[PDB]
Every structure is written in structure tokens, then in C-alpha cells.
Design a protein around this ligand. Structure first.
Ligand SMILES: C[C@]12CCc3c(ccc4cc(O)ccc34)[C@@H]1CCC2=O
Ligand SMILES: C[C@]12CCc3c(ccc4cc(O)ccc34)[C@@H]1CCC2=O
Lengths: 125, 125
């Protein structure tokens, strides 16, 4: 909760930068050591930087680009939400996915929890 | 959870239509009889259609316009999130607010919970 609303926007916007360039290790470092990731929201949670790193590597190493599609909405309790689009190549087929992540940051300015909202109704070829 | 992902997008997009025209009674009817609203997220929850109606009337009757700024992100468990902008007139001063609502729908296709993410860093004159 330590991050102010402006710090949240900055942090979350940097995250999207990292996913865009694919700096997996830099992304894992933004998360708390024991953070949880629910992506897509509804699935079972992923816990810990090791698992998170595996998750991101499995999804980024290949091909994948991402960018904010609107400003970052931030609350005053270290929480935030942002809209963005991901463009990837699915086994030859060019694809895009519109997503919204809700993140809760801890007192050290690290991501404690992340939830990504999307399903195939958000996929587009 | 009854609503499919496509039904979620439709429902949430209709909600924004209702806020745009200001049909308060129609908006209250989209919510479950005992739904809770947290707006801005972080504040104490509002419970029940009576309180919800008061909330919406206090905020809409005046002046206020709203519209989706991106597609609706929907999961498969009756949950959804959408980005939108609200344009209002603050005591003479024209203003806009970028928001993201996360909604959970119940088995009857009604909104059980709504959380709006935003703060003054999202306000713009
Ligand atoms: C893995 C993936 C690329 C990146 C990505 C996806 C879904 C949600 C995400 C949420 C994030 O916060 C960062 C990256 C992704 C896609 C699912 C299908 C795909 O190719
Ligand atoms: C009340 C309000 C107009 C409508 C509105 C606001 C904030 C969050 C919202 C979330 C909604 O899902 C629907 C409408 C609003 C503004 C706060 C300042 C203002 O003028």
C-alpha cells in the first residue's frame, strides 16, 4: 500500500514495458518473493517467483508485444488496474488479446497479487 | 456465474449505456437485490438496491455522460472488467474521469458486486 496513486501508474506502466521487451527476470523482480498470479482470472493461482518466472518465460520467450490501451486507474490503497493489448503469433497465426490486469502492491512497492481478466471473447485474429 | 463470457460483455456494455442516459431505476435493476458497490474501490461498501439507487441518483441527476473506451474483458466464471470514461461538469468546471469497473454477476445474470478503480490521478479538466 506504500505506493502512492502516481507510483502505481508508473509501476504498472513499467510492467507493460517489461512484458513488451520480454525482460523476464526484470518482470519477476517486480513481484513480491511470494506473490500470486491468477491468469486468466478463474484459473488456479501461481505462487512464488520461481513459478511466476516459469509462467512468464513459457509465455514470452519466442514474438510477443504489448502496450497500454488506456491510462492506469489507481486507488489510494496501493491497488491498480490497467487496460492493454497483447499481440502474439499463434503457431503462425497472428493474434491479439485485450486484457485488464488488477494489481495490488505491497509496502515495498512490489506486486503482491495480479489478476488478469480475459477469455477467448477477447481474442482476435 | 450463469452468464457466459459473451453475456457478460453485453450486460456490462448495457450498464454503461444506462449510466450514459441516466436511467437510474434501470441501473438499480441490473444489480442483485442485495448487491454491494465499492466506488471508489477502497471506500466502505454500499449494500442493497435502496442505497445503490441513492448512490446513483446522487451522482447522475444533474450533466453526466459515459462510454466504453475499450472492449469488455470477461472471464468464464461470470466475472468481467471494462474500461470507460465519464464526462461531467463539476460546479461549472468541465471534467472527465477514466475508470475501470470489475463486476461479478450472479446466477440470475444480475450484478452481485461492483468495484470501480480510480482516484484523482484519473481526473482531468
Ligand atoms: C501467454 C500469452 C502472451 C502474454 C499474456 C497472455 C495473457 C495475459 C497476460 C497478462 C499479463 O499481465 C502479461 C502477459 C500476458 C497471453 C495468453 C496467450 C499468449 O500467447
Ligand atoms: C459521481 C461521478 C459521476 C459518475 C461516476 C463517477 C465515478 C465512478 C463511476 C463508476 C460507475 O460504474 C458509474 C458512474 C461513475 C464520478 C465520481 C465524480 C462524479 O461526478
Amino acid at each position: 500500500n506504500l505506493p502512492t496513486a502516481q507510483e502505481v501508474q508508473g509501476l504498472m506502466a513499467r510492467y507493460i514495458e517489461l512484458v513488451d521487451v520480454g525482460d523476464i527476470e526484470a518482470i519477476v523482480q517486480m513481484y513480491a518473493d511470494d506473490a500470486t498470479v491468477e491468469d486468466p482470472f478463474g484459473q488456479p493461482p501461481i505462487h512464488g517467483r520461481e513459478q511466476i518466472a516459469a509462467f512468464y518465460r513459457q509465455g514470452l520467450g519466442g514474438k510477443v508485444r504489448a502496450c497500454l490501451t488506456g491510462p492506469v486507474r489507481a486507488s489510494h490503497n496501493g491497488c491498480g488496474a490497467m487496460p492493454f493489448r497483447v499481440e502474439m503469433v499463434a503457431n503462425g497465426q497472428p493474434c491479439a488479446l485485450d486484457v485488464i490486469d488488477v494489481m495490488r502492491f505491497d509496502e515495498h512497492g512490489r506486486i503482491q497479487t495480479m489478476q488478469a481478466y480475459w477469455s477467448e471473447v477477447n481474442l482476435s485474429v
